[PDB]
Design a protein around this ligand. Structure first.
Ligand SMILES: CC(C)CCC[C@@H](C)[C@H]1CC[C@H]2[C@@H]3CC=C4C[C@@H](O)CC[C@]4(C)[C@H]3CC[C@]12C
Ligand SMILES: CC(C)CCC[C@@H](C)[C@H]1CC[C@H]2[C@@H]3CC=C4C[C@@H](O)CC[C@]4(C)[C@H]3CC[C@]12C
Lengths: 216, 311, 349, 33
């Protein structure tokens, strides 16, 4: 039975290696990117880094990150979205000035609604990024926003328009308890964006750690 | 088929039990394959590595790290020297099994697809057929690593495909309610099968090779043959509306397995089309199930990160 | 050790030395009843009143009260009932934790370890009940074995609670690096270390406990005769209730601050459930810790009054009964506050 | 023909029915269980 013992010990050793690798993988935070064709701005402006999906290894505050862009997948979203369960947070990059271009905002609304109604990401929050805010001011001086948001009932001030857009995204979050949407207006400085990402990930981790008890 | 099969004797209830429990995975499993040795099976998960399971002794023999963590399918070559896996990176990786120096290393990294790889099958020891998410199925060769033959007859996201016993015929199903056979030698579609209303996720051939069973997402299993071509046999339960993930056949084809996503698997009769057994040993969604060539044991993986073998 | 359960009927600390007189009629063996007190001397005044120079004279010529007995009889059935409910609850909790949908969970493993320590408490109690009911003992070793199990269970339970509080502190406030600091294997190793620490700390408490005729007396070699009692009392106080309070006070304060900063107080039921379990832990153990500290001061003549001594002895007995009720009430609080736990009860219903 | 195909399938099923371990009970020692 010497060969049986050799096989058993080899299997135990590789099982220990597998357990260590799995623990290491769980020690790394995973994130998912989504949008309406415009995304990856945060990765580009990160200034540093380490195919259907692109994995961009990223570490901040001694915490590893894993962003998997899926904008290159032309198949049905729901069919390859269920395999993304367990991701701490979902990064949603949408261009602010997409309302004028044509229907883009309607497509983004539909995608957000589908994401929030896929009965697969109930326990994972969604991180919202509003891109192209620097262009938004000169895009909005001319456009009254009424074309994309009929009955807006507001002034042309940037503050009110941004508040109303964030209100739109708040309304989509049918479940306001399980998922907490965090929104931040992406800016030129990468420090603020990475700080917001870190804060959102920390909040998600804190929320998850409150559901690992044996009483729930 | 029901009228013809009215006078036969149903198999009846079977007390299927978990012969052994395999708990070497910490993540869900999407697909698995049964080897010709009737003792080794392959499973894949999100841990970022592929392992080969020895059901007879309840041990793992190989531990192959995967470059693409988001592996969605795997297959085990009939010769037992090559193991293939898919993923979301649109690349099918071929790994040797102790071919040289006893260690495990990647033989080739097949590439050229755009949509996610949903299922791969080792047609022969040299040519591998893979199904991608871009509506096209490509037959690759390890020696040259290029599409020997490309099939674009489908119009939807192809999900799974199976291999005929003669290793010269395969079919795949897509989202559209239309699956048509493809011939390796002919290279063009020959038979078209319809009758579905939702997506198709499970495809496997009847061991005789003259028919195949598929499971859609509307809790319906349909049998298609090469003679009638009108879906002579249809299977339904009228109790649940959940979809079907994986479907397989017994050695003789009398007993059929269904990978229903209601936390348990349903075992039906190919001809009787009646309930035969329930496999409620899984605590999560089930997407893996296969019958060994000799039929001695049956494996079944699930999203619960555990795999169990039924005798 | 485990001072509550004893055959203590006379105690004498106020007066030890007496002049040799003919009034002596006999000398009761208070050592057998409780070797915390030495041999007492009895006078001829028809009442229970109380050295080397008197010992020779006595040979040549030749109080706790009964309230404890009545309390003990009621105390006996008390441990009987709380055994049934507490053991059933702990077994159900252990089964639920073992049959967990999500494995490799640090919190679940720690909770299971705490349940096992509570089970040690439950398993060791019946031995003391059997000792009280009959005054027989078991091979002069079951008493000591039961004392060791009592201390091991108590110290493990207190230690396991503290590390869970530390684990929650990490996982909440320092999540940036807690994931990297702790994993399933690390949690198992820390649990084994906590078990080892419980063994080490409880060893001196039960290191010298020779089962007496009807109790667990102590060898107390001449050097350690005074250190062993005071060492046991200070150890079970400082490391039992005082330091855990500070560690839990530090932790839970930080989780609350983090939740308020993150506006997660609304979703803070999970931390609250442990907090209610933690606060009741102190409330039930506080009467035991104060009394055991007071009797420690008794060595310094803190309560020389005989009536005060009886009151302290009664207080110590009842609070140990309170602790016994708490160890079975802990799963009860778990069911009251737990949500999935209630589903398990209905699942097995 | 549909009837001919069904008859052939049934004949194939019954021919190998005795050789299918799942269909009929088998000794525990015989199979790896
Ligand atoms: C409230 C008081 C009385 C409880 C005492 C706290 C002590 C016993 C706890 C706190 C943190 C624990 C340690 C945390 C880290 C590890 C590393 C692990 O690989 C072995 C055990 C070890 C070394 C633990 C042993 C016990 C420990 C030191
Ligand atoms: C070693 C010393 C310095 C530790 C002392 C820490 C003290 C300040 C901690 C321990 C427990 C904490 C309390 C625990 C519970 C709450 C309820 C919450 O809704 C408001 C704050 C409040 C009331 C905390 C305030 C601060 C607190 C009292």
């Amino acid at each position: 039975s010497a060969e049986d013992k050799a096989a058993v010990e080899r299997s135990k050793m590789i099982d220990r290696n597998l357990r260590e690798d799995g623990e290491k993988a769980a020690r790394e935070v995973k994130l998912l990117l989504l949008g309406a064709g415009e995304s990856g701005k945060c990765t580009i402006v990160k200034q540093m880094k380490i195919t259907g999906i692109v994995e961009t290894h990223f570490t901040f505050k001694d915490l590893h990150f894993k962003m998997f862009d899926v904008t290159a997948q032309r198949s049905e979203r729901k069919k390859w979205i269920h395999c993304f369960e367990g991701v701490t947070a979902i990064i949603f990059c949408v261009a602010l000035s997409d309302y004028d271009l044509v229907n883009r905002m309607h497509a983004s609304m539909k995608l957000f609604d589908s994401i929030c109604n896929n009965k697969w990401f109930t326990d994972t929050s969604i991180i919202l990024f509003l891109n192209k805010k620097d262009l938004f001011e000169e895009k909005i001086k001319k456009s009254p926003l009424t074309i994309c948001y009929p009955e807006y009932a507001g002034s042309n001030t940037y503050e009110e328009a941004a508040a109303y857009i964030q209100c739109q995204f708040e309304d989509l979050n049918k479940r306001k308890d399980t998922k907490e949407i965090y929104t931040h207006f992406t800016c030129s400085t990468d420090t603020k964006n990475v700080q917001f990402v870190f804060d959102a990930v920390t909040d998600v981790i804190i929320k998850n750690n409150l559901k690992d008890c044996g009483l729930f | 088929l029901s009228q013809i099969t009215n006078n036969i004797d149903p198999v009846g209830r079977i007390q299927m039990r978990t012969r052994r429990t395999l708990r070497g995975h910490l993540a869900k499993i999407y697909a698995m394959h049964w080897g010709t040795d009737s003792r080794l099976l392959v499973s894949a998960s999100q841990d970022g590595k592929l392992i080969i399971w020895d059901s007879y002794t309840t041990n793992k023999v190989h531990a192959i790290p995967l470059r693409s963590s988001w592996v969605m399918t795997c297959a085990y070559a009939p010769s037992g020297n090559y193991v293939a896996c898919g993923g979301l990176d649109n690349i099918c990786s071929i790994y040797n099994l102790k071919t040289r120096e006893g260690n495990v290393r990647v033989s080739r990294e097949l590439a050229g697809h755009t949509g996610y790889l949903s299922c791969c099958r080792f047609l022969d020891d040299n040519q591998i057929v893979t199904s991608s998410g871009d509506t096209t199925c490509a037959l690759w060769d390890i020696e040259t690593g290029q599409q020997t033959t490309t099939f674009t007859g489908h119009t939807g996201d192809v999900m799974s495909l199976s291999l005929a016993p003669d290793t010269r015929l395969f079919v795949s199903g897509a989202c559209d309610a239309s699956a048509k056979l493809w011939d390796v030698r002919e290279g063009m579609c020959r038979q078209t099968f319809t009758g579905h209303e939702s997506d198709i996720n499970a495809i496997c051939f009847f061991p005789n090779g003259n028919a195949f069973a598929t499971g859609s997402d509307d809790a319906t299993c349909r049998l298609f043959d090469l003679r009638a071509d009108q879906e002579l046999m249809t299977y339904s339960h009228d109790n649940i509306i959940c979809g079907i993930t994986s479907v397989s056949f017994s050695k003789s084809g009398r007993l059929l397995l269904a990978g229903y996503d209601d936390f348990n698997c349903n075992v039906w009769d190919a001809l009787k089309a009646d309930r035969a057994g329930v496999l409620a040993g899984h605590d999560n969604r089930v997407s893996c199930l296969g019958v060994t060539d000799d039929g001695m044991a049956v494996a079944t993986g699930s999203w619960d990160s555990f795999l169990k073998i039924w005798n | 050790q485990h001072h509550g359960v004893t055959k203590c009927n006379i105690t004498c600390s106020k007066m030890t030395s007496k002049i040799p007189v003919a009034l002596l009629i006999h000398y009761q063996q208070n050592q057998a009843s409780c070797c915390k007190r030495a041999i007492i001397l009895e006078t001829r005044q028809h009442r229970l009143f109380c050295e080397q120079w008197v010992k020779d004279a006595m040979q040549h010529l030749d109080y706790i009260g009964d309230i404890v007995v009545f309390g003990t009889v009621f105390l006996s059935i008390f441990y009987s009932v709380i055994f049934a409910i507490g053991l059933v609850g702990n077994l159900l909790v252990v089964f639920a934790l073992t049959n967990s949908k999500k494995p490799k969970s640090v919190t679940d493993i720690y909770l299971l370890n705490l349940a096992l320590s509570d089970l040690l408490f439950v398993a060791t109690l019946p031995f003391w009940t059997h000792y009280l009911i009959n005054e027989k003992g078991l091979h002069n070793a079951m008493c000591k074995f039961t004392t060791a199990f009592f201390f091991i269970g108590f110290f493990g339970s207190i230690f396991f609670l503290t590390v869970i509080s530390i684990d929650r502190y990490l996982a909440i406030v320092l999540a940036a690096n807690s994931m990297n600091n702790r994993t399933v294997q690390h949690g198992v190793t820390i649990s084994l270390g906590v078990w080892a620490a419980a063994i080490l700390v409880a060893a001196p408490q039960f290191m010298f406990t020779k089962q007496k005729e009807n109790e667990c007396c102590g060898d107390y070699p001449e050097v350690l005769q005074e250190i062993w009692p005071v060492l046991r009392n200070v150890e079970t106080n400082f490391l039992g209730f005082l330091l855990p309070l500070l560690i839990m006070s530090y932790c839970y304060f930080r989780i609350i601050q983090t939740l308020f900063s993150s506006k997660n107080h609304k979703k803070a039921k999970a931390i609250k459930l442990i907090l209610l379990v933690v606060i009741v832990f102190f409330l039930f153990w506080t009467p035991y810790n104060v009394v055991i500290f007071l009797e420690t001061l008794k060595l310094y003549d803190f309560f020389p009054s005989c009536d005060m001594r009886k009151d302290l002895r009664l207080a110590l007995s009842v609070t140990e009964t309170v602790a016994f009720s708490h160890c079975c009430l802990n799963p009860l609080i778990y069911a009251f506050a737990g949500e999935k736990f209630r589903r398990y009860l209905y699942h097995l219903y | 023909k549909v009837s001919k195909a069904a008859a052939d399938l049934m004949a194939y099923c019954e021919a190998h029915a005795k050789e299918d371990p799942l269909l009929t009970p088998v000794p525990a020692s015989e199979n790896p269980f």
